Each structure stands twice: as structure tokens, then as C-alpha cells.
Amino acid sequence: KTYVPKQVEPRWVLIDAEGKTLGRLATKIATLLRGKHRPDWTPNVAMGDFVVVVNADKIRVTGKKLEQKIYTRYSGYPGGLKKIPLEKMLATHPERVLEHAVKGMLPKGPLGRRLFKRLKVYAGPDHPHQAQRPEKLEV
């Protein structure tokens, strides 16, 4: 039957990251940024949780390390599709490696979009989370 979505229901949450492992932690973080889990869960949003994770870096590698290259081919074509390996990957942009997992499953242009918006982390150690002064739910 019916059952229409509430109203401005805001919830954030702090994720460890560190120590946890690559992909799987992603699957999680992932669906986590639901839109389906708390009532009136669906198209127009719902949870997804304004979720933020730290120690984003210090993640455990799927035992692969090297042999996993992200790309950035803005490329003025016949340029470079810039191949890069997880190592340096993180070295400068770890929060991002995870990122690629994240987007990895995050879908829908405008929507998913907005979700990455409510999806933030910092391979910073945590202090970043601190910067995100607000509530600090957790797992």
C-alpha cells in the first residue's frame, strides 16, 4: 500500500576503515549509503547515511598490491589514460582508492551524486571526522 516518505530525517555515521579490508568494506560502506533501510526508503533518497570514514588510508589490500591500476584519461585524446597502481594510488589519494570502490557501486547521476555528497571520508586519521563537527554515529 501507500506509505509516503517522512521529512528531513538527518543521520550521519563514523566508519573506522583502517585495518578493515578493501572491497568487502566497500560492499558495505556501499549499500550502507542506502536510500533503503530506514522507513520511506527509496527513489528520492532515504538514509544512505551522511557517512564519513577515516584512516581511510591504512586499509588492508586485497592481497593484490600492484596489478591494480586506476585510470585518469581526461586525455586531450592521444594523451595518456594515466595508468596508476594502488601504491602511490593511496600514497597521495587513498581516500580516493576507496572512493573508486565507493562510486564503484554508487549509481544514478543526480541521485547517487547527491549521495557521494552525503558520502565523505578522509584517509586523514580521524581528526577530519572531527572537522565534521556534527553528530558521530558509529561502526
Partner 1 sequence: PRAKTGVVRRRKHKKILKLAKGYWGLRSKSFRKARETLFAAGNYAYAHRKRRKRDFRRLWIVRINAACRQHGLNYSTFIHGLKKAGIEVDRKNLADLAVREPQVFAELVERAKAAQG
Partner RNA sequence: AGUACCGUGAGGGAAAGGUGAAAAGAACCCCGGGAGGGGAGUGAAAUAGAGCCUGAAACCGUGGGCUUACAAGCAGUCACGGCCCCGCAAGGGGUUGUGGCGUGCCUAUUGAAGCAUGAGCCGGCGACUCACGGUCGUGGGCGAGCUUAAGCCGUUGAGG
Partner RNA sequence: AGUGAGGGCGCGAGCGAUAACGUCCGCGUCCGAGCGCGGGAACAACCGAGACCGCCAGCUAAGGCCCCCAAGUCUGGGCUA
Partner RNA sequence: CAGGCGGUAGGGGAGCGUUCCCGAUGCCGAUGAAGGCCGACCCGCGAGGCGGCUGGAGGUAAGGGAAGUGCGAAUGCCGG
Question: Can you give the binding site for partner 1, defined by CB under 8 A?
Answer: 1, 3, 36-39, 41-42
Contact in structure between 88 and 73 (CB atoms under 8 Å): no
To partner 1, the closest distance from the beta carbon of 41 in angstroms equals: 6
Q: Find which of partner 1, RNA, none residue 105 binds, CB within 5 to 8 Å per kind.
A: RNA
Q: Find which of RNA, partner 1, none residue 39 binds, CB within 5 to 8 Å per kind.
A: partner 1
Q: Find which of RNA, partner 1, none residue 65 binds, CB within 5 to 8 Å per kind.
A: none
Which among 84, 86, 120 has a CA at the least distance from the CA of 103?
Answer: 120
To RNA, the closest distance from the beta carbon of 104 in angstroms equals: 7
Gyration radius from the chain CA atoms: 16
| Pairing verdict, β 69-71 and 83-85 | antiparallel
Q: Contact residues for RNA (CB under 7 A)?
A: 1-2, 4-5, 23-24, 26-28, 30-31, 36, 43-44, 104-113
* Nearest-angstrom CA–CA distance, 15 and 138: 6
